[PDB]
Amino acid sequence: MTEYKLVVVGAGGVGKSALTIQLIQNHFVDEYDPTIEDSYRKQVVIDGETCLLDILDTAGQEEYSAMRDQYMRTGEGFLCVFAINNTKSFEDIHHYREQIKRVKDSEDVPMVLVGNKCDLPSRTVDTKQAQDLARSYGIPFIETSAKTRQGVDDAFYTLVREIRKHKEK
């Protein structure tokens, strides 16, 4: 069993805790405080390998910058989640990519672009927009929903596989 640290990165309100809890407790949560930051452990047999995925639902602003940079350095995978009905959080993705690349001091970082709330209207972020952005970062992009659970398992599985490829590079 290989232990893998899967951290979710995104803006406050994209559904970090929701998507995480959905796969951990197998149920959607409508009300959950965004300040709640905790990690969850889940052993999944991916490709014949039982990997222990340690998913982290971070809050945002830490008490100390060192701790911030620390959890980012030990993080193996970074799930970039945004809202398809919000351009603000979509543009915030550039900040995360830039930051993580500096914090880990590495350009090759296993990331996966995930567009949550694909079942909701007012879609401002075009699929082509996100796809092009993902291609520019050399990472995959999957539309998901914490409600319909569409492509959720796939998005997470891909993230783990991306890490693997980076490890066996």
Ligand X SMILES: Nc1nc2c(ncn2[C@@H]2O[C@H](COP(=O)(O)OP(=O)(O)O)[C@@H](O)[C@H]2O)c(=O)[nH]1
- Residues of this chain that interact with ligand X (CB under 6 A) are 12-18, 30-32, 34, 116-117, 120, 145-147
Q: Where are the beta strands (DSSP E) in 63-129?
A: 77-83, 111-116
10 is in an annotated binding site: yes
CA distance 145 to 115: 8
Asked if 163 interacts with ligand ZM7 (CB under 6 A), we say no
Residues β-bridged to residue 114: 81, 142
Decide: 104 and 111 in contact? Cβ < 8 Å: no
Residue 16 backbone dihedrals phi, psi, to 5 degrees = -55, -55
Which of the 8 DSSP states describes residue 121? S
Sequence letter at residue 129: Q
Residue 81 backbone dihedrals phi, psi, to 5 degrees = -105, 140
- Subset of 61-90 contacting ligand ZM7 (CB under 6 A): 67, 70-71, 74-75
- Please tell me the count of residues contacting ligand ZM7 according to CB under 6 A: 11
Q: Which of ligand X, ligand ZM7, none sits in contact with 120, Cβ below 5 to 8 A by type?
A: ligand X
Q: Which of ligand X, ligand ZM7, none sits in contact with 80, Cβ below 5 to 8 A by type?
A: none
28 vs 71, beta carbon nearer ligand ZM7: 71
138 is in an annotated binding site: no
CA distance 150 to 166: 26
The candidate with the shortest Cα–Cα distance to 37, out of 20, 59, 54, 61, is: 59
145 vs 158, beta carbon nearer ligand X: 145
Q: Which of ligand X, ligand ZM7, none sits in contact with 74, Cβ below 5 to 8 A by type?
A: ligand ZM7
38 vs 132, beta carbon nearer ligand ZM7: 38
Over the window 20 to 49, marking each residue x when it contacts ligand ZM7 by CB under 6 A and - when it does not, the resulting string is -----------------xxx----------
60 is in an annotated binding site: yes
